[PDB]
Amino acid sequence: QVQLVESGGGVVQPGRSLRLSCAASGFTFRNFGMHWVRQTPGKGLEWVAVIWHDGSNKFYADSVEGRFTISRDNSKNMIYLQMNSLRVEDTAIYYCARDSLFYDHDNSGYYGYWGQGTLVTVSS
Amino acid sequence: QVQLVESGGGVVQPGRSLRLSCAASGFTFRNFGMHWVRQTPGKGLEWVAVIWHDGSNKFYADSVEGRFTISRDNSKNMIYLQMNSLRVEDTAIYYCARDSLFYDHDNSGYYGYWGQGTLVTVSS
Amino acid sequence: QVQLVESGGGVVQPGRSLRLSCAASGFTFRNFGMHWVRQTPGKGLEWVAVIWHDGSNKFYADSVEGRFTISRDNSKNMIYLQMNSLRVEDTAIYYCARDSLFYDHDNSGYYGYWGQGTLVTVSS
Amino acid sequence: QVQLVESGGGVVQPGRSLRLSCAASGFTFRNFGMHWVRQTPGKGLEWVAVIWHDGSNKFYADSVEGRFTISRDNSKNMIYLQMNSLRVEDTAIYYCARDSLFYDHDNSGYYGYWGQGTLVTVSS
Amino acid sequence: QVQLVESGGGVVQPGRSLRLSCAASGFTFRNFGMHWVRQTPGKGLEWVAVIWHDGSNKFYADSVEGRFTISRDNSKNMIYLQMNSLRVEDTAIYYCARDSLFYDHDNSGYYGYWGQGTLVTVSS
Amino acid sequence: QVQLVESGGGVVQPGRSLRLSCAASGFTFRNFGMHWVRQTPGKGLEWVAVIWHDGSNKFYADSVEGRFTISRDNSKNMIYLQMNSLRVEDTAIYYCARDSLFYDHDNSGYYGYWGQGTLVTVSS
Amino acid sequence: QVQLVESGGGVVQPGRSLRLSCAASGFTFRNFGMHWVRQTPGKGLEWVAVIWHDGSNKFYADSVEGRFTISRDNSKNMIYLQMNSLRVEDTAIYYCARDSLFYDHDNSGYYGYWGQGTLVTVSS
Amino acid sequence: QIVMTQSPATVSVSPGERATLSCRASRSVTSKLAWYQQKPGQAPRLLIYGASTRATGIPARFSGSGSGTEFTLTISSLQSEDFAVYFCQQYNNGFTFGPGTKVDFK
Amino acid sequence: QIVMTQSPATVSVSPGERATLSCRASRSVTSKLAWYQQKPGQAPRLLIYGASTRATGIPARFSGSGSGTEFTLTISSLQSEDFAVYFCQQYNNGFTFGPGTKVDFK
Amino acid sequence: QIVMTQSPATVSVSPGERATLSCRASRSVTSKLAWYQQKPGQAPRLLIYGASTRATGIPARFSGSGSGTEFTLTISSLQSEDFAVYFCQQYNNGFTFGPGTKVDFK
Amino acid sequence: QIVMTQSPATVSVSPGERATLSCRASRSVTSKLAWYQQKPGQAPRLLIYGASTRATGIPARFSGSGSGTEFTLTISSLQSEDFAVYFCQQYNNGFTFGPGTKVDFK
Amino acid sequence: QIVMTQSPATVSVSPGERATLSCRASRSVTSKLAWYQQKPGQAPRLLIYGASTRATGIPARFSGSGSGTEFTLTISSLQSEDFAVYFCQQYNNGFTFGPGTKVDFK
Amino acid sequence: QIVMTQSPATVSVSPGERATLSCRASRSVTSKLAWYQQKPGQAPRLLIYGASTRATGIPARFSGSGSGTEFTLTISSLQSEDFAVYFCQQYNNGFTFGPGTKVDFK
Amino acid sequence: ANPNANPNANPNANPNANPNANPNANPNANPNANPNANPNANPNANPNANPNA
């Protein structure tokens, strides 16, 4: 019973800062890498960032490079996405997704377990 | 004389928790990692979990992910397998397995020494 | 907003040592490899050196092989270029350039983001 | 200043073992592959062995196949040649050579920079 | 001194499996491709299989296609031939033969060095 | 014992897509190229498509140009034929055929080993 | 369904350069050679250039030799025609034509399939 | 990076027949491509990973195939509870998604 | 490409007799022409390949010959199992098959 | 992960003969494969580890071989005690076992 | 390594007219050739990467193309801000730049 | 593939007399043909490779020549140790050997 | 591999005159051929690499040319320090040198 | 001459190709290799790491 629950959603103004949180349970949190996925109507799903199991490596998409900051604490089984300098293009639903159903060395980078998603919109 | 004696077997109804214990003697306990191996008639041997020498890291199979917990203390030379949320797919013999015959960097992950194991059956 | 600023420029005599620095911000510094580009009036742009993301590999142009040294510090977001045995034909404007706009495995080596450039003059 | 110096030469009896050492300076050693070139008077220049940049691959001439071992230590900027089962026909001057003046993918195998050479003689 | 020593020969019943092993010494094993050659009295020499230098490509004769499997392991300087579904037509002396005397790009496919050979007899 | 078995047959409506698969065993799959052959009662045998050993080249018949797509998976020993935009003229039995009995450079393009075939019917 | 569509048309001044592009779909693009055919009112139909399947050979008409350049990209299924040093004699409709209906070794060079054509006007 | 295109955007079918869904990538993806099913109101569900391997719990009705640049998703006998929008992802070079295609009642 | 024809359409020969099957190509195919044997309900079997060479396991009863545009397949002493339909294929230019010739009891 | 298969499932062997056991993996395993012997009522015992190296106390009777996706276990001259079930394990990517093969009296 | 050349050295184009620049390679560079724009007193700006792909933020006015040894850069309707010197780089083999082509008023 | 025939099967020669051997190919082989010498109880030894090139350590006594479908091996002054059976191999199309020609005392 | 020949073995030219050296290969070498200059007691010095490209620091006096199997090295107007032995190397297939041609006073 | 590709070419592999390693390959380190970090590497902790001391 793996449940991923997102939080930290709401409304904010452009140029401000927002922080998203994701809580993970039902699996060994420290043994897997976590992702964030964005869904904009009219465009489809869009990848945001990935973090290694221990947080050693963090990779971001081009559209969000230099503004979003992903982090993790294996002691609380929680995932964060510190989202600075939000822009009007960022209105979407953010999914906390897990990499791989199980560990296959030559097959990684696909999201097996998704969360219900949180809505983040920016306007005035 | 590396001897592995297992215990904690019995009958547990589905949805309840069972705990297995494995007492090991005849070798330096804290210097090796221990495994649990599951043997089901009609399915054969199936890997369950592995722990590190100092208990820093824990890895589980996909079928037992999030339900089974492996623990180890070095002062009593014993490993444990806390099995919550038992299901009828889990009826089998659980073996205590030692990793490697001797410490080699490029060759580890084979169960050199085995214990007799206990029968854990779940039903109504 | 990827901002690159060079430093360490000035006037030195031939045969002396000069050390250029380049501070990077606005992106994940440790995930990309940075270059150095030299612009001599009357000759145009010319490549100098490249460094891997972790600093594992370093490559230099033939005109600067054995005299120039490229290094990086991922904990300070700085790119360095130690210029030993400096000569009169190395007088130019040095640009700190980042490789690629985003990560594409089959397309790498172009400078998406340039610094403003520093002036190094070697004369008596 | 590409400087190559050779050592380990001298006089040996046939059938004995000799080891030649080459010290390289003035360039990034680990980025280039090195050769050994043999000059026998009355026969001319002859190639002996080649080693990749990281020592991955080693190719020898037929005349020295199975008797000579080439190696490199990228941390010490040193090129080695092990001369086992030495015979009279192996008496010559041995040149430490670097492949290519600069990296060209479609042009490699020529020796841009040579060492001064060391004399190895085999007789009773 | 290129020396090839075959082994694994003997007598087997038709339809059973026999594995031949070929030990090579006196040359760089990983740089050359190795062959298997079959000699039946009354018919002459017959080619069986060939393996590339890295083991990437394997080719077999028509009479042994799908039944014989050639393999190599460069870390032990050994050449293997797995013979499944043996038939009475497969009795012969099997020679381990190295391809070419030296590397020539436009001349390859001749056996410069042959092994001593081993006898495989199939009958009841 | 080269056995070729196909699947993916059935009844489809005109204008829809069907995918045929062909499993190959008993020979080195990646060393040979495979064909698809069409047999229609009242018209006879017809050629459809060919693929190279590594899948580099694909050639289709005029009547199937742009609608059928041949592909191969050398890791699973399977041959596939995607048949989009099906028309009533495509009702036939499709055979998986291997090119040539053995390698002959000047003689290739005949189907030595066939499969049993599958029936594809297009109708309303 | 083979469709050829041209683009890049328009009006240019004499002595300037224009680039026509042709998009191809509905067939295996990399297996056929493409042509450019010119139609000037009052003169009739005229051939311009031809390119091999992989672009190894390119042949131009006498009137366009040395000024026009034909190329192709098999990864984008597009045919180009660089028209350098244009003159008033080049005012015509340019068609993208494919060679032959199907592959016949002794019958090639006829334009089975034509595009809709694009208009290039050279004037001031 | 690699741009994914799906065709057709929408397909019309009645329950009980076979539905084919196509995914095409600009550059080669070898055999690393995943399919996701998203119904209105909740997150997409991983159906197929690799090129044809099915996720645990996915019925054998969902069949995937293809490699390189051409990929297809085939449903043997399309049912009612599974009418949704399907997405195509490649994880060989970067992480991109397809525009998504929809299955609808006929 | 090359249009292949066979003559006669059917042959009637008693067992033990010699049956000759002819084949003609529209254009020259040099020495690249194979013969296939198909029994009802079975996949075709390669008997002769190139112009005359015999596939492994084919009895010496089957004899193929010819070159250019005139090819013949000769069965010296036809047995009971040699009653089938025989196909003529060229692979010199393209891959085309003949209409097929049936061998029937006399 | 990696799926293991063994063939034949059971083999009939008289004492003094030579028995061959085959193990095949779906994907490459390089040189990390082990063979285990289990007697009825007994825990499995490690015979061979890595690809061919023999565990201490194992007689030279047992000879393992193979690399990549094909592995083989052979027994030089089986006595009565060599009749049991044998398992094939890989520890290169995950930990998966084969179905297990049995040697039975002929 | 690879010597980059551009022709003509200077091109005179009035605003609203189409300007074309050429870049030629000694040996084939496949499709790895980037274009840069430099205004006086400023660092070069990446316009095109690959062979035709446009950098983010670059107006659709800049349209480049070419592969192999012949590359071109086309400005569909040159504005007042498009007066600068444009450099041609190849990164297929080494990192070499072109001499640069200047666009000036007519 | 290529059928290799040697003629004559056995040649009678005395020491000091020049002995010749002939090798013929069914189709063109160009200049890829090796000669091997096998003594009773010994593995074949490579004498000549290519069409005339001599293996290292082979006395200049052995002389080969020919190209296409006619290859000959000539021993200028056959000594006492030159009595053996000589094999002819082609490696142009496949790897086929000849039946072998034996030289014996006269 | 390839046997490399040079002709003539010795050339005599007065200072200010043009000296030409020839290099011939047994098989095709294309455009992979280097020239080396060795003075007595010194290591060889790379003059030409490829077929005509000149190493850095070598004056424009030395001009290499040729392709395939015919290669020539031309010294336009030889000075006093250009008296040495010139070696010809091919690196197209293996690494073979030439015997060396000496330039001497007249 | 015919500009179309030849479907009658040999689709089978060529065993006559040279099986020996080529010494003429470039031994110099390639500077054109991608210097950017690879995001597609496995982010999951490896269970096959040695668990002993």
Coordinates of C-alpha atoms in Angstrom, one line a residue, chain B:
Chain B
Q1 CA 31.5 -24.2 12.3
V2 CA 29.1 -21.6 10.8
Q3 CA 25.7 -22.7 12.1
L4 CA 22.5 -20.8 11.4
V5 CA 19.5 -21.7 13.6
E6 CA 16.1 -20.1 12.8
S7 CA 13.0 -19.7 14.8
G8 CA 9.8 -17.7 15.0
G9 CA 7.7 -20.0 12.8
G10 CA 4.1 -21.0 13.3
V11 CA 0.6 -20.2 12.1
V12 CA -0.7 -16.7 11.7
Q13 CA -4.0 -15.6 10.2
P14 CA -3.9 -13.2 7.2
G15 CA -3.6 -9.5 8.1
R16 CA -1.6 -10.1 11.3
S17 CA 2.1 -9.8 12.1
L18 CA 4.7 -12.5 12.6
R19 CA 8.3 -12.1 13.7
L20 CA 11.2 -14.5 12.7
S21 CA 14.5 -14.8 14.5
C22 CA 17.8 -16.2 13.2
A23 CA 20.7 -17.0 15.6
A24 CA 24.1 -17.3 14.0
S25 CA 27.3 -18.7 15.4
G26 CA 30.7 -19.8 14.2
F27 CA 31.7 -16.6 12.4
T28 CA 32.3 -12.9 12.9
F29 CA 28.6 -11.8 12.8
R30 CA 29.2 -8.1 12.4
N31 CA 31.5 -8.4 9.4
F32 CA 28.9 -9.9 6.9
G33 CA 25.4 -9.2 5.6
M34 CA 22.6 -11.6 6.1
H35 CA 19.7 -12.6 3.8
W36 CA 16.3 -14.1 4.0
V37 CA 15.3 -16.6 1.2
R38 CA 11.8 -17.9 0.7
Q39 CA 11.1 -21.4 -0.6
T40 CA 7.5 -22.1 -1.9
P41 CA 6.6 -25.6 -3.3
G42 CA 5.6 -25.0 -6.9
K43 CA 7.5 -21.7 -7.1
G44 CA 11.0 -22.5 -5.8
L45 CA 13.5 -20.3 -4.0
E46 CA 12.6 -16.6 -4.0
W47 CA 14.7 -13.8 -2.5
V48 CA 13.1 -11.6 0.2
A49 CA 15.5 -9.2 1.9
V50 CA 19.1 -8.3 2.6
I51 CA 20.8 -6.2 5.3
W52 CA 24.3 -4.7 5.5
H53 CA 27.0 -5.7 7.9
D54 CA 26.3 -2.8 10.3
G55 CA 22.6 -2.5 9.4
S56 CA 23.0 0.8 7.6
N57 CA 21.2 -0.3 4.4
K58 CA 18.2 -2.6 3.9
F59 CA 16.8 -3.9 0.6
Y60 CA 13.6 -5.9 0.0
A61 CA 12.0 -7.7 -3.0
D62 CA 9.1 -6.2 -4.9
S63 CA 6.6 -8.6 -3.4
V64 CA 7.5 -7.8 0.2
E65 CA 8.2 -4.0 -0.3
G66 CA 6.7 -2.0 2.5
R67 CA 5.4 -4.9 4.6
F68 CA 8.5 -6.8 5.7
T69 CA 11.2 -5.3 7.9
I70 CA 14.6 -6.8 8.6
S71 CA 16.6 -5.8 11.7
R72 CA 19.9 -6.8 13.1
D73 CA 21.7 -6.3 16.4
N74 CA 25.4 -7.1 16.7
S75 CA 25.5 -7.7 20.5
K76 CA 23.4 -10.9 20.3
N77 CA 24.4 -12.3 16.9
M78 CA 20.8 -12.3 15.6
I79 CA 18.8 -11.0 12.7
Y80 CA 15.0 -10.5 12.6
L81 CA 12.3 -10.3 9.9
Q82 CA 9.3 -8.3 11.1
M83 CA 6.5 -9.4 8.7
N84 CA 3.4 -7.2 8.9
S85 CA 0.3 -7.6 6.7
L86 CA 0.7 -11.3 5.9
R87 CA -1.1 -12.6 2.9
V88 CA -1.9 -16.2 1.8
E89 CA 0.8 -15.8 -0.9
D90 CA 3.4 -15.8 1.8
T91 CA 3.1 -19.4 3.0
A92 CA 6.6 -20.9 2.6
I93 CA 9.8 -21.9 4.3
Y94 CA 12.0 -18.9 5.3
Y95 CA 15.8 -19.5 5.2
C96 CA 18.5 -17.6 6.9
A97 CA 21.3 -17.1 4.4
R98 CA 24.8 -15.7 4.8
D99 CA 26.3 -13.6 2.0
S100 CA 29.6 -14.9 0.4
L101 CA 32.0 -17.6 1.6
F102 CA 34.7 -15.0 2.2
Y103 CA 35.0 -11.2 1.7
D104 CA 35.7 -10.5 -2.0
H105 CA 35.0 -7.1 -3.6
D106 CA 33.9 -8.2 -7.0
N107 CA 32.0 -11.4 -5.9
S108 CA 29.2 -10.9 -3.3
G109 CA 25.5 -11.8 -3.2
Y110 CA 25.7 -15.7 -3.2
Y111 CA 24.3 -17.5 -0.1
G112 CA 27.4 -19.6 0.9
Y113 CA 26.0 -20.9 4.2
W114 CA 22.3 -21.7 4.8
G115 CA 20.2 -22.5 7.9
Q116 CA 17.4 -25.1 8.0
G117 CA 14.7 -22.5 8.2
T118 CA 11.2 -22.5 9.7
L119 CA 7.8 -23.1 8.2
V120 CA 5.5 -20.0 8.2
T121 CA 1.9 -20.8 7.0
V122 CA -1.0 -18.4 6.8
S123 CA -4.6 -19.4 6.5
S124 CA -8.0 -19.3 8.1

